[PDB]
Amino acid sequence: MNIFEMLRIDEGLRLKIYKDTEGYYTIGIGHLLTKSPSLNAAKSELDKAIGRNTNGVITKDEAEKLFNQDVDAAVRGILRNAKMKPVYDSMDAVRRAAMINMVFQMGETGVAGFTNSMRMMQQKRWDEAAVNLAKSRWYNQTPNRAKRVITTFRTGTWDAYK
Ligand SMILES: [Cl-]
Ligand SMILES: [Cl-]
């Protein structure tokens, strides 16, 4: 188990444009294309990202290539963030994977509003942090994913994903 396999389970894999859980156009392994309601807008975004006229469809290989860039960006986004970096650096490998999961799904921004949970994380008060993470739109909207990520932080194991 690792970050790749971990996200691949949370996000699934789809080769045509689809709407995510928030109703936004996505493709591949959770690669958000655009927040706009326009499909054309999405298809343009798509062609720009892939580098060709896709017509809303891509190959597995292209999916994977977006996914790689996106995991990388997530990481680096974290390392570049003054509030997150230190939290992340205080943690072990599993728990780091969980934070990158969050950052991947909700962006640097979304994750940055878990200030309180992060402070607990940094203090290593796991069960408390787990409780606090649950009090969130995030948990209320995608509860099963949320629970998985939360178990991961609380336990420091991959149990929720095995
Ligand atoms: Cl891109
Ligand atoms: Cl869910």
Swiss-Prot record:
Effect of residue 11 to N: Loss of 84% of enzymatic activity
Keywords: Antimicrobial, Bacteriolytic enzyme, Cytolysis, Glycosidase, Host cell lysis by virus, Host cytoplasm, Hydrolase, Viral release from host cell
The UniProt record lists the keyword Magnesium: no
Record-listed substrate binding positions: 32, 104, 117, 132
One GO BP: peptidoglycan catabolic process
Domain of life: Viruses
Active site per database record: 11 (proton donor/acceptor), 20 (proton donor/acceptor)
Catalyzed reactions per annotation: Hydrolysis of (1->4)-beta-linkages between N-acetylmuramic acid and N-acetyl-D-glucosamine residues in a peptidoglycan and between N-acetyl-D-glucosamine residues in chitodextrins
Pfam families: Phage_lysozyme (PF00959)
Keyword Hydrolase: yes
EC number: 3.2.1.17
Matches recorded under Gene3D superfamilies: 1.10.530.40
Induction / repression: Expressed late in the viral replication.
Subcellular location: Host cytoplasm
GO CC entries: host cell cytoplasm
Effect of residue 26 to E: Complete loss of activity at neutral pH; covalently bound substrate
CDD domains with a match to the protein in the record: T4-like_lys (cd00735)
Field pH dependence: Optimum pH is 7.3.
Function summary: Endolysin with lysozyme activity that degrades host peptidoglycans and participates with the holin and spanin proteins in the sequential events which lead to the programmed host cell lysis releasing the mature viral particles. Once the holin has permeabilized the host cell membrane, the endolysin can reach the periplasm and break down the peptidoglycan layer.
Protein name: Endolysin
Species this protein is from: Enterobacteria phage T4 (Bacteriophage T4)
